[PDB]
Design a protein around this nucleic acid. Sequence first.
RNA 1: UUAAUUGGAUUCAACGCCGGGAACCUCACCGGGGGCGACGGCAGGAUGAAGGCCAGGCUGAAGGUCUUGCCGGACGCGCCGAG
Lengths: 123, 50, 102, 45, 115
Amino acid sequence: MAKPSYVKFEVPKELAEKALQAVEIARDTGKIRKGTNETTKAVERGQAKLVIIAEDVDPEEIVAHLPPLCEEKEIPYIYVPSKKELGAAAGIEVAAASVAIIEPGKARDLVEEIAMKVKELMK
Amino acid sequence: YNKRKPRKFGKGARRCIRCGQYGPIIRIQGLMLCRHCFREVAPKLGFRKY
Amino acid sequence: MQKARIKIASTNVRSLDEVANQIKQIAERTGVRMSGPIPLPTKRIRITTRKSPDGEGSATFDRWELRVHKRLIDIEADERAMRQIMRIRVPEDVTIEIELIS
Amino acid sequence: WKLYEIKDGKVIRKNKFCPRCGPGVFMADHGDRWACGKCGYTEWK
Amino acid sequence: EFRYRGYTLEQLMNMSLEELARLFPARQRRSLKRGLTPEQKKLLRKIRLAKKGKYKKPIRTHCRDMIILPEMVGLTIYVHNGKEFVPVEIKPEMIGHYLGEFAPTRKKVEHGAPG
RNA sequence: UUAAUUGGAUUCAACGCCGGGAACCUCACCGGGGGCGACGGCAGGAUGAAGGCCAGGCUGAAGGUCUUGCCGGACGCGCCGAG
């Protein structure tokens, strides 16, 4: 299983789990924008503090624009091995292709860590 | 589109307070009551027969 | 000299008489000239309506009435005298309106 | 999201931003005009 | 030739709306002074675009109250009588009259055997 | 008679009666147009509106309808029970 073309770094299992946990915590006690349209809208608006992107998305054009945009706007972005897991972390039955944390809520320490652990990935 | 047009005048303008009928409404000093509705509440209002 | 004019309007006759008597009894206790209660005309609201809810049968009419009575009490200027009138217990059906004429 | 192309690390966008309500509003590229369908605003090309 | 208050149809053409209405009776002139309805104004836009050729649709209408002016002359318009749009063609002689006058809505009543 | 003149009322006790005022409204008639149908289940969802929107055509007109494409940033097509 070759990684999708938009992939720029390999996320460890623990780091993906922490990203999903931050998504859950930001849903509960913060704000997460669900769906890639609102993800791009917030990242363009600059209100996103982290971007979680699925890896098993069959049409890669949905998430082909998220890595370079995120590197353009200096908003850290992280990957998760499944969009079903991202929908579960976001509390929506449909598979959440991507999630944009606006208010980390009680995930701040995680996101601040995750971003740092994202900041070592492209290095 | 579903909003009734605003009628200040005409039979449609005034509706009975109690039963809402668009027909006979008594407006002597601000009742807004259907003529049927008046008979059952006149004693409550203090009206007496003489 | 300054005069205080009190209009007392009510459907109930006896409540009107009670309030007027209360003001009167306050008057000579306070020792201030108090012109006697003048009973103005009693206004008679009359409403005539057909009895029949439907249209069938003989045409019959019912005439309902309100008689609202009104008395005028003029009193002279003494702050003690006009202080003792907000303390009056006033029944619900009686309405008092007090103005001040030079 | 299909209205966001990206080339050489910068995002090109297939339509204009409507100035009346700031970003987040794509609006019609009719060829002859930049027509905004949030309120009917139209800037003819 | 056709004359209206001592003026011809083409003479009527060049008169301003106020002077034109001054030839109308009190009812129509005062209706005009009070202002046409917005729907009447939309119909006026329609008929004026038709007279310039841009508006090629067979022109209908509901505004029975639209008072005929000299500018409607020579055009076919279909007024709603309540069930369908009866057609009328505007000759010069309808200047000073309402559309609803020429849009029949009640059928002819004739008399048969009593019940 | 009418597409329609909405219905009730039949002597005493139906016929300036319900209608106690019909240009709209009243309105229940007729013609035409437009929007729905609470709340549950089946299915969908958000991948984005269900609602509005320029330029038009239809449409009396009404982004109602469609060409066109936006929003709108949020869950509501269709069938069944039931409203």
